[PDB]
């Protein structure tokens, strides 16, 4: 478990520094303009809270999953938009001035909608209630290591736009070093993950959920005829999820032996999400080159 605590601390520092780097690409005026007249934000919220949990429900019903496995899929589905989308949307020149709005409003709306969707969906899968085990002190606390670095980044750019360099290179160097450290800390647990006989249905579900998220986001954006960058921004916000709540919910609700192999599910979700995001990024950059 000390490895888990070290991973959490290194990941918190990772988020802090990467968002300090990322906060240089937006301005407060554009944030205000995009927050007003909520067109893109409404579509992103409707997507993330009506088509990703419904996809979780239908996919769990159709793949013939257990009660606990279906519960894990549902909890990952209902989770708020992750902070991975902020980093990813830069890789295809998405409207970064709107991805922050999406992430913040998604977290705030999750704080009060996750129990509602969980109660509406887990009927027949869970005997008790899930409106009591959702960590409300973590949803609103995960938002701080995102807003604080971004806010100091925009303040640095707007007030003193001469320290643009130097800090960027130092942040990239420390990010690379801590990423190598996390790789070392994770390769020792991937072995136990593969030793555990995770059912191939769950691997298929974790690989196929983000793909459906991305494609349904793109289709939804195309239906309402959004812009160019905003289309990719919504189509990749609606697919990235914060699966660090699934582990907490499962640990609180069920004994450590009932979840079993599902304790490694968030790592699998992250690795498949990274793989699919990077594949899409490479495809889009190749498209832009031609």
């Amino acid at each position, epitope marked *: 478990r000390p490895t888990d605590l070290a991973l959490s601390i290194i990941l918190v520092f990772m988020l802090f520094f990467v968002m300090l780097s990322l906060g240089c690409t937006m301005e407060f005026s554009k944030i205000k303009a995009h927050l007003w007249k909520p067109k893109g934000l409404a579509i992103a919220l409707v997507a993330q809270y009506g088509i990703m949990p419904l996809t979780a429900f239908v996919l769990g019903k159709v793949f013939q999953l257990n*009660n606990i496995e279906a519960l894990a899929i549902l909890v990952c589905g209902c989770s708020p938009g992750g902070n991975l989308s902020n980093v990813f949307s830069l890789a295809m020149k998405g409207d970064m001035n709107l991805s922050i709005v999406m992430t913040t409003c998604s977290t705030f709306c999750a704080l009060g909608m996750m129990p509602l969707l969980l109660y509406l969906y887990t009927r027949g899968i869970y005997d008790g209630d899930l409106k009591d085990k959702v960590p409300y002190g973590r949803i609103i606390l995960s938002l701080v290591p995102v807003l604080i670095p971004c806010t100091i980044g925009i303040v640095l750019k707007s007030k003193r736009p001469q320290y643009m360099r130097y800090v960027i290179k130092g942040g990239m160097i420390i990010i690379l070093l801590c990423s190598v450290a996390v790789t070392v800390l994770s390769a020792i*647990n991937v072995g136990k993950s593969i030793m555990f006989a995770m059912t191939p249905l769950l691997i298929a579900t974790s690989s196929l959920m983000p793909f459906i998220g991305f494609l349904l986001g793109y289709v939804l954006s195309a239906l309402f005829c959004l812009n160019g960058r905003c289309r990719r921004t919504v189509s990749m916000e609606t697919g990235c999820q914060n699966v660090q709540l699934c582990s907490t919910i499962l640990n609180v609700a069920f*004994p450590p032996e009932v979840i079993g192999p599902l304790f490694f599910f968030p790592l699998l979700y992250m690795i498949f999400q990274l793989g699919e995001g990077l594949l899409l990024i490479a495809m889009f950059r190749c498209y832009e080159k031609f």
Partner: antibody
Amino acid sequence: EVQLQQPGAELVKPGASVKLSCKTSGYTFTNYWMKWVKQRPGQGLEWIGEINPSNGGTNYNGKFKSKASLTVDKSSSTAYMQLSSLTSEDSAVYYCTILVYDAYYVFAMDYWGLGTSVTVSS
Amino acid sequence: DIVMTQSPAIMSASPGQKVTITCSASSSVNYMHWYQQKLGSSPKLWIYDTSKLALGVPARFSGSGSGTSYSLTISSMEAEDAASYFCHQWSSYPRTFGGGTKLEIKR
């Protein structure tokens, strides 16, 4: 050493209520779930319910939801049960179990109580 | 709920011959765990996740199978193994134990 202490036997009257205690010592009481198992002589084991001492959340069996009420008291480390409105077919042996389980280094180990032989006298 | 049809209910065996106990679930179960209860004692975990061994169980025991048919195999039976074995699953609530087989010793 881990030890779970249970009363040897309890005597009741039909239609009455009884409280079963499972005093645990030698380990921190608020980490492992406490599972209650009922064994009727002549049948297999039946699972009754769980309870997380540090949180209070419980999961019951389908047919024991209206007969069992698991409760804990972390100050005394004592996990309780309250069978209600006993019948002639409730005469059995009730065990309290904790299961150690982890995935970092895979291993498991059970710690069972001695069983509280509950019978209906009349 | 998943019911278990564990057969045979009563088994006769010899100290040195291989014996097998089959637990036949009535629905798809991922993992099946076996409990051993001796004479006048609380059952203790014996084999969990259908192939692994608990702490203290001798290495002779072994479980196999997947789907809705799990088996427990003893390579070389000894006189200390005469007890009752229950198959137990916790992957789909409520947890349901099997009917149990009474393993004896022949002479």
